Design a protein around this ligand. Structure first.
Ligand SMILES: O=C(O)CCS[C@@H]1O[C@H](CO)[C@H](O)[C@H](O)[C@H]1O
Ligand SMILES: O=C(O)CCS[C@@H]1O[C@H](CO)[C@H](O)[C@H](O)[C@H]1O
Ligand SMILES: [Ca+2]
Ligand SMILES: [Ca+2]
Lengths: 121, 121
């Protein structure tokens, strides 16, 4: 299991100790407050009122928590995943990333606290 | 395990099928959008900018997801709990509740989708 902070301004993302392997079932819970620029802050689902202006994940709002597994594209995490299994052929290290537009992470702030565990399978 | 919706206007709370027993470890993941009255909506952590005007749970923001276990007082849930154990002497059915001021639930809208499972222990 892994617990750590994911900084909103960390464009490369936060690498975890979790290596997702075929057949694995995992659970993620994410909490906290972060911003993609404004003085306001949002939770791990991001800002539902803000337009997508080139986000690294088009399937979640700006400011949402997303992830990559090995060399996958971005996958929405939001507040978390419950006893979740990955798509076929998706495997490898889990990296957590704040959803923002490439090159615009410098004015971000805050972070999410995240737990990941592997479940019975 | 249990999956269901918790309506923001449900003042009595949503009873789940989970009976928390001594020693149990549980995980909860909550997602979605709801409001305590304004046109805007907030996620399961509620509205960090809104003052507490008599919330059923003073340890969470207005519009946050909270719970009671048996005859316990309210306990924050927010986006979820990861492999969590209850305080001593807390046991019974888990009821999930939107955090608002008593008697002011009538103008609430939206809901959270919540999963609860018991973990290995
Ligand atoms: C202008 C609105 S705020 C704007 O939103 C962008 C993403 O869409 C970037 O994250 C920014 O850095 C932020 O200033
Ligand atoms: C006051 C601004 S909105 C106000 O906030 C409340 C709780 O603090 C109640 O939920 C009311 O229903 C709501 O209209
Ligand atoms: Ca930004
Ligand atoms: Ca209300």
């Amino acid at each position: 299991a892994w617990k750590g902070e994911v900084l909103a301004n960390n464009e490369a993302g936060q690498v975890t100790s979790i290596i997702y392997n075929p057949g694995d079932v995992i659970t993620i819970v994410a909490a906290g407050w972060a911003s993609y620029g404004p003085t306001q802050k949002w939770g791990p689902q991001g800002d539902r009122e803000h337009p997508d202006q080139g986000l690294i994940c088009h399937d979640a709002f700006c400011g949402a928590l997303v992830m990559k597994i090995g060399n996958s594209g971005t996958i929405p995490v939001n507040t978390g995943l419950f006893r979740w299994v990955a798509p076929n052929n998706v495997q490898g290290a889990i990296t957590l990333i704040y959803n923002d537009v490439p090159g615009t992470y410098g004015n971000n702030s805050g972070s999410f606290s995240v737990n990941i565990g592997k479940d019975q399978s």
